[PDB]
Design a protein around this ligand. Structure first.
Ligand SMILES: N#Cc1c[nH]c2nc(N)[nH]c(=O)c12
Ligand SMILES: N#Cc1c[nH]c2nc(N)[nH]c(=O)c12
Ligand SMILES: [Zn+2]
Ligand SMILES: [Zn+2]
Lengths: 369, 369
């Protein structure tokens, strides 16, 4: 396959369905990327992640540079070989995580220094770490502006991100092997302000990237506000390149974002919530720990085709989670990820058949009932 | 198949290899039974347990009567359906666990009352709970004498166990469905005293059971003492019925016990130790958390045919366990159980080929080196 080729096969309104061809495989879009922190999609073997239908997973520059270390993973053969996932992997730049999980931080034009549990992370080092990990889709090193933010602070932050986007591009292009085998996505910032989003989109397009991520919309904004910002933000991005909404993933968030032109998603909800006892169903989420499921023989979801719903009852999983058993986490996580992939498939198919708007409406009606 | 049929195919010294045919399947002996507390072999799907080569797993009357409850499991269809294991399951009687995990206990001729986290457990209730769970191999309700024990205390304890063995037999035989579909094993007690072991063996044989377990030898005795007791204890049991050494499982313990006539084993070592970072290898156990494995690309064991050793490196698993990742527990546990089953296969094959003594010697030489 080519290093990178995004092709749109069908459209309906602002929604699009297609494929991204990369050396390690094809990614069907709209796509949901399970999150793999600490070089593992929590509680799942890579073959199980693949069985649920995932075409690509997300890795993180921040966590991996700390443990087990970027240089170490490179010495061992790369992240793919390390964790046993041979398909595409998108790595976040650390731009967000360094300010979310670090103990103490020092931000400057050069980058961000921090202490975990002292390290420096700059556009150049972020790109290099992603190279050492052997990432297929490299994310530019950005700054995720806190929400809410004053227009002045949002502007300063976005402007810095754009300067960092240019530095990310040059660092990526300077490494032959990386430039020839991986792809680079730029990240749009600007908080919830249209003029800032426009300036960011324009700056990113001027630099040129293989894909464009919409950053900063998963840090406190309610769905109404997020959708409102997507309404004017996505159209600012190049139409012929993938649009990636970072960190967004509640089922209904995803459907609404696809309706607004988004092609890729990632979020820890499926996995994290799964381990906490929340299972997704077409009738809305349920918390399996609830006593009403102690003797419920039905599967997590009545239509779900996943291996978990084919074999075990809500009653068993209820028992497992309430007992703190590892198998409980494994089963809840596989089902949730499988549910998310089934959602993406229904989305792709409906767009391809020109009935996505109807699908969106039917989905909400049942999900919110 | 028949309700129960034990056939010995080959022998070498006191060692035997054969099969136990039961309605839900065939059990190859010598056999190792992975332990499944809380209706789950920790961190493994039942299909994975089966993939490692396990023919039967162990369930526990004590833990299940507390959570989720025996009557509840019966209402839901039985333990097999509940946890998704359709092969034979041996259930311990609770005789041991009630005195090991209970907060406060009250022992009497009638049975044992206790509080967990008030419940009564008697021979009759134990047998009934195992019936409600749908156990294939039911264990008599006994008393596991603490070690060490004075001859007087050991005698009193054993005598009570034998009276309870008779009560267990009658309770089992009184339930038509259970008597026709499951098997009943008696449990030999008597601490480390030959005369008490003899009296117990004789009492059990007089009552008559489908199999005979050697109890009380997994509560503090060193290997030398345990082997010494097995030397005179196993020969006291009926030759044509299975001999089950309860709670014994270190690799070398197993080899030595097979050399002494034991046909079945169970122990939490493989699973519990696996989650703690200990991996079994033909060269002895290793603790994967050790820094010397941070960049070791070799599999857990160089010869192991398990899925874990086919795909992941010690370096990856080291990282997983040190990060507290669930996949670490899953991988360590699958490998350890697979290693134990591979050990049983090597044992069965060597006995069948009349070269078990040589196998025992070669195994120790390398394992202890
Ligand atoms: N909101 C939001 C985000 C979620 N992940 C992100 N990763 C990066 N690099 N930037 C961002 O803005 C976000
Ligand atoms: N030692 C030892 C044992 C391990 N499990 C046991 N289970 C029962 N019922 N009795 C026993 O003596 C033992
Ligand atoms: Zn499911
Ligand atoms: Zn192995």
């Amino acid at each position: 396959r080519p290093r990178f080729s995004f092709s749109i096969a069908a459209r309906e309104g602002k929604a699009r369905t297609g494929t991204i061809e990369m050396k390690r495989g094809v990614i069907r879009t709209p796509a949901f990327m399970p999150v793999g922190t600490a070089a593992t999609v929590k509680a799942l073997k890579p073959e199980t992640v693949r069985a649920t239908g995932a075409d690509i997973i997300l890795g993180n520059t921040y966590h991996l540079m700390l443990r087990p270390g970027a240089e170490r993973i490179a010495k061992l053969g790369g992240l793919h070989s390390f964790m046993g996932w041979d398909r595409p992997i998108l790595t976040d730049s650390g731009g967000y995580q360094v300010m979310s999980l670090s103990s103490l931080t020092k931000q400057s034009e050069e980058g961000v220094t921090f202490k975990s549990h002292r390290h420096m992370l700059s556009p150049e080092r972020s790109i290099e770490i992603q190279h050492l990990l052997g990432s297929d889709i490299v994310m530019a090193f950005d700054e995720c502006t806190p929400y809410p933010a004053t227009p002045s602070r949002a502007a300063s932050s976005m402007e810095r991100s754009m300067r960092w986007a240019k530095r990310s591009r040059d660092a990526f292009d300077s490494r032959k092997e990386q430039a020839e085998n991986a792809a680079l996505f730029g990240i749009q910032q600007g908080s919830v302000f249209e003029n800032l989003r426009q300036q960011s989109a324009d700056a990113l397009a001027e630099i040129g990237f293989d894909g464009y991520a919409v950053g900063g919309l998963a840090v406190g904004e309610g769905q109404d506000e997020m959708f409102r910002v997507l309404d004017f933000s996505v159209p600012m991005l190049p139409d012929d390149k993938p649009h990636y909404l970072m960190g967004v993933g509640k089922p209904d968030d995803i459907v609404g974002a696809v309706e607004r032109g988004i092609d890729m998603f990632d979020c820890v909800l499926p996995t994290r919530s799964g381990r906490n006892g929340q299972a997704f169903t077409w009738d809305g989420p349920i918390n399996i720990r609830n006593a009403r499921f102690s003797e419920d023989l039905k599967p997590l979801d009545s239509e779900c085709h996943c291996a978990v719903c084919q074999k075990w009852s809500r009653a068993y999983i209820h028992h497992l989670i309430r007992a703190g058993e590892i198998l409980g986490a494994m089963l809840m996580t596989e089902h949730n990820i499988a549910f998310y992939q089934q959602l993406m498939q229904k989305i792709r198919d409906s767009i391809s058949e020109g009935r996505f708007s109807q699908f969106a409406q039917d989905f909400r009606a049942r999900y919110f009932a």
